[PDB]
Amino acid sequence: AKTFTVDVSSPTENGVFDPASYAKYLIDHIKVEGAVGNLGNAVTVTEDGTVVTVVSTAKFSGKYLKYLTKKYLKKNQLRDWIRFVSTKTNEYRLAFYQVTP
Amino acid sequence: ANLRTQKRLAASVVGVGKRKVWLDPNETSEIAQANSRNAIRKLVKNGTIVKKAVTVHSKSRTRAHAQSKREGRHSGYGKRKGTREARLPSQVVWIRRLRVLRRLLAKYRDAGKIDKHLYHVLYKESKGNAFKHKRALVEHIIQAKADAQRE
Amino acid sequence: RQKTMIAEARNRKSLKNKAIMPRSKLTKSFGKMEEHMSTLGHDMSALQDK
Amino acid sequence: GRYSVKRYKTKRRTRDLDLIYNDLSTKESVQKLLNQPLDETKPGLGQHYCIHCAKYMETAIALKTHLKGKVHKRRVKELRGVPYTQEVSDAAAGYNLNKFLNRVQEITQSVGPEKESNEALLKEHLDSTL
Amino acid sequence: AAQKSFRIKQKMAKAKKQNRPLPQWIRLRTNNTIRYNAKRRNWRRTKMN
Amino acid sequence: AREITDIKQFLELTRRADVKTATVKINKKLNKAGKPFRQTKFKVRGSSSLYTLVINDAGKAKKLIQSLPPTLKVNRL
RNA sequence: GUGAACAGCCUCUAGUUGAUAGAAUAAUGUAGAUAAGGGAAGUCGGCAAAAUAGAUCCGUAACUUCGGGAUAAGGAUUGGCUCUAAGGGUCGGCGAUCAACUU
RNA sequence: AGCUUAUCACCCCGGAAUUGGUUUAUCCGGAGAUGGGGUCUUAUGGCUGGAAGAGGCCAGCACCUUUGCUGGCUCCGGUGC
RNA sequence: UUCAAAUGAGAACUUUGAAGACUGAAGUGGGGAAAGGUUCCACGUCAACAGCAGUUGGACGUGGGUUAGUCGAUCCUAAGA
Ligand SMILES: [Zn+2]
Numbered sequence: 001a002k003t004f005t006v007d008v009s010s011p012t013e014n015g016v017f018d019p020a021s022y023a024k025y026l027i028d029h030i031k032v033e034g035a036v037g038n039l040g041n042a043v044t045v046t047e048d049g050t051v052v053t054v055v056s057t058a059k060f061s062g063k064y065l066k067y068l069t070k071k072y073l074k075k076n077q078l079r080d081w082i083r084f085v086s087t088k089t090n091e092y093r094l095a096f097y098q099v100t101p
Numbered sequence: 102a103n104l105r106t107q108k109r110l111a112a113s114v115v116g117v118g119k120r121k122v123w124l125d126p127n128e129t130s131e132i133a134q135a136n137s138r139n140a141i142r143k144l145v146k147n148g149t150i151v152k153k154a155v156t157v158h159s160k161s162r163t164r165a166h167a168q169s170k171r172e173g174r175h176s177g178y179g180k181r182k183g184t185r186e187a188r189l190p191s192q193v194v195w196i197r198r199l200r201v202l203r204r205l206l207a208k209y210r211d212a213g214k215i216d217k218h219l220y221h222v223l224y225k226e227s228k229g230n231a232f233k234h235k236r237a238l239v240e241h242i243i244q245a246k247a248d249a250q251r252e
Numbered sequence: 253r254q255k256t257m258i259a260e261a262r263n264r265k266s267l268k269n270k271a272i273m274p275r276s277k278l279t280k281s282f283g284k285m286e287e288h289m290s291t292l293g294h295d296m297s298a299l300q301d302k
Numbered sequence: 303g304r305y306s307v308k309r310y311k312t313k314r315r316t317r318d319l320d321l322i323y324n325d326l327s328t329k330e331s332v333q334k335l336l337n338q339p340l341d342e343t344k345p346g347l348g349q350h351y352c353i354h355c356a357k358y359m360e361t362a363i364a365l366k367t368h369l370k371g372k373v374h375k376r377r378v379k380e381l382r383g384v385p386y387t388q389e390v391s392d393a394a395a396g397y398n399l400n401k402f403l404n405r406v407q408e409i410t411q412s413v414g415p416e417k418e419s420n421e422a423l424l425k426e427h428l429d430s431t432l
Numbered sequence: 433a434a435q436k437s438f439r440i441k442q443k444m445a446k447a448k449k450q451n452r453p454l455p456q457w458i459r460l461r462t463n464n465t466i467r468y469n470a471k472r473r474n475w476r477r478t479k480m481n
Numbered sequence: 482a483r484e485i486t487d488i489k490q491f492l493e494l495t496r497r498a499d500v501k502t503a504t505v506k507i508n509k510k511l512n513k514a515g516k517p518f519r520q521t522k523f524k525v526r527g528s529s530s531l532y533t534l535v536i537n538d539a540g541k542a543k544k545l546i547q548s549l550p551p552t553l554k555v556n557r558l
Numbered sequence: 559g560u561g562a563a564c565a566g567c568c569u570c571u572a573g574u575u576g577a578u579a580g581a582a583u584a585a586u587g588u589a590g591a592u593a594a595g596g597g598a599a600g601u602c603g604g605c606a607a608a609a610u611a612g613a614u615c616c617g618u619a620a621c622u623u624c625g626g627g628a629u630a631a632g633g634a635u636u637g638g639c640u641c642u643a644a645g646g647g648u649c650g651g652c653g654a655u656c657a658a659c660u661u
Numbered sequence: 662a663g664c665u666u667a668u669c670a671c672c673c674c675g676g677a678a679u680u681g682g683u684u685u686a687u688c689c690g691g692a693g694a695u696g697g698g699g700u701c702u703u704a705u706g707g708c709u710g711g712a713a714g715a716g717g718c719c720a721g722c723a724c725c726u727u728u729g730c731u732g733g734c735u736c737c738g739g740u741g742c
Numbered sequence: 743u744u745c746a747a748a749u750g751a752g753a754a755c756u757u758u759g760a761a762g763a764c765u766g767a768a769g770u771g772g773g774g775a776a777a778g779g780u781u782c783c784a785c786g787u788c789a790a791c792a793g794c795a796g797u798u799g800g801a802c803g804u805g806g807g808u809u810a811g812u813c814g815a816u817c818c819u820a821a822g823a
Pocket residue numbers: 352353354355356357368373374377
């Protein structure tokens with residue numbers, strides 16, 4: 001298997017983000033062998049409130065995860081302020097840009 | 102002011118052309134103070150001078166057209182504009198074919214499916230034509246062996 | 253509003269020439285994101301502290 | 303511009319599909335044009351004349367390659383239905399409706415399958431001789 | 433060029449050391465007739481062979 | 482630049498009386514594809530050449546460090 | 559990338575955005591383009607322009623120093639999409655597996 | 662820099678017509694082929710040393726600096742008129 | 743070709759940024775030979791020159807800059823002197 005781990009503390013604390021909607025987006029928009037609706041025993045998306053987590057036996061990659069997360073942020077109008085980054089291998093997190101006063 | 106030297110030096114430092122490098126117009130005095138590559142590096146890291154990532158050249162269309170060509174499209178007489186030879190030399194075709202026929206006969210002789218004398222006559226017949234491909238050569242071999250055991 | 257978004261991005265992009273700047277390196281104001289997130293329906297009491 | 307001007311001149315005007323319909327309609331018309339005595343001026347010296355595409359070829363093999371082509375199929379797929387006369391043009395505007403409808407049912411009943419059978423005889427005749 | 437001989441380079445060095453205007457403390461001299469350098473040279477105007 | 486396999490010749494080089502400097506390099510490597518392990522490179526600076534010894538096992542490596550002579554200067558990392 | 563192609567057309571890297579400017583849109587010019595019907599009546603003279611043009615197939619006369627003439631001439635076609643067939647290599651005492659554009 | 666690696670060429674055995682081997686291109690063989698084993702040039706490639714410590718790509722952290730320092734990754738392949 | 747800002751007494755022509763285009767790897771690119779000789783780079787800087795302009799310049803004034811046992815000459819001989 002393969003595990004991937006997103007952290008959502010930064011935006012969620014300041015009140016722009018809800019991890020449950022992000023996981024609700026991921027769990028349906030993730031594709032396996034074609035289109036939506038094939039996550040049978042292969043993939044498991046689960047949140048804690050501060051950390052979202054994905055576990056996949058099927059084809060899944062950090063670039064795919066970043067692609068989905070950026071799509072969600074563009075949906076909720078957050079692409080121009082937040083970026084999905086890697087802090088460690090398969091350990092990613094959302095982070096604001098360098099906005100200063 | 103005049104940041105020509107600074108643009109040149111920033112290009113030479115970052116390892117790109119001047120067409121890429123970017124000077125924020127607000128930090129003009131801070132850039133004009135710089136007359137050294139160390140200072141330009143400081144301005145590169147602090148965020149006053151950046152790199153301007155590459156102008157793209159996508160190949161989605163080219164890959165799609167190539168896939169359609171693999172599937173056998175865009176090949177008709179209205180798309181052909183050079184001769185059949187210029188597109189594919191008959192010399193190349195004959196080379197492939199004759200190498201194939203030589204290799205097959207060598208393998209058969211080494212395995213023991215055929216003797217050296219029949220190999221020798223087939224070598225020169227395949228050097229000539231009357232063996233158009235692997236199938237015809239195999240069928241001729243089968244006919245030969247069958248009439249031989251019939252005799 | 254979808255048409256307005258398309259029209260805005262048409263001016264914003266200009267992509268066949270010069271490869272839009274990355275946001276990693278740029279810096280934006282505060283007040284801009286205030287207006288943006290107020291329009292989105294969030295409140296900035298957690299950001300004002302900061 | 304030049305292409306339309308220099309192709310579709312009234313000098314270089316061709317033969318108005320209505321008439322090709324009226325010609326492929328009946329037996330005697332198609333047999334006459336298949337026979338077509340030796341004329342010194344015509345391209346193929348008479349013979350080798352396609353009726354759908356009202357055209358004289360040089361030879362039998364040039365007829366073959368014409369028939370195995372989309373220029374022929376363009377015309378045969380254009381000539382299946384009714385021929386669009388002024389009757390149609392005015393029945394559309396509300397003028398001599400009953401004449402148009404009589405012509406339509408006449409083609410649907412009588413003249414249609416007549417011409418279809420004539421075309422089929424033409425096709426197997428040409429395919430057998432060629 | 434760029435693979436000069438020392439003769440050519442020596443002549444070039446003389447030309448460089450000559451390529452100047454006239455000093456200002458010569459204007460201020462008793463009975464000074466000289467007001468400019470009439471043997472002045474520039475790479476684009478005149479060639480020195 | 483030269484590699485060595487034997488240990489006796491590395492000791493001879495350390496005692497060659499024209500060597501002043503050595504250095505130990507540590508690398509993290511994967512074996513075959515499989516497991517992390519600690520490779521060690523003992524380099525000694527001759528006058529003409531740089532001789533080097535590759536030791537995969539750290540236990541033998543540190544005993545080599547012990548058996549090195551004391552006057553020779555060494556550089557870690 | 560198209561295409562036989564270092565052709566022509568567009569683009570990536572790198573470089574440049576230099577050549578006195580602004581407002582109107584008369585004639586005559588310079589550089590191009592289109593024109594009904596007729597088609598060389600023009601003119602010293604078909605000058606110039608037009609037309610033809612690539613690739614596949616059929617077919618190709620006199621004459622000939624037999625080597626050519628010859629792309630002679632003259633004719634049928636060319637898009638897109640979905641398919642069929644054929645054209646190969648490596649291993650196993652016919653199969654498993656892999657792969658390209660040519661018709 | 663060390664080890665290894667090749668077409669041509671050469672050596673030992675053996676003695677060839679039912680003539681055989683063989684190049685895209687037809688030349689070679691009792692002046693000793695095919696076959697079996699072996700030798701050589703090491704252009705050229707492979708591994709290692711050089712050499713990751715370099716360089717490249719990212720993430721940071723001081724923010725008072727006209728040089729401020731840490732952490733991660735840098736892998737495995739495929740194809741051709 | 744255009745827009746804003748900066749500089750400046752003054753900006754169609756300078757600098758930065760934002761756009762639009764061009765050369766289109768047989769280049770408006772990156773390097774060299776002959777020739778030129780400091781034209782390279784920086785700091786000041788506009789009287790004359792850049793067929794308009796000019797705060798700009800290959801201009802004007804003042805300085806800085808070209809590091810070789812391994813690149814070349816040097817050596818060899820060629821036609822020849
Ligand atoms: Zn027809």
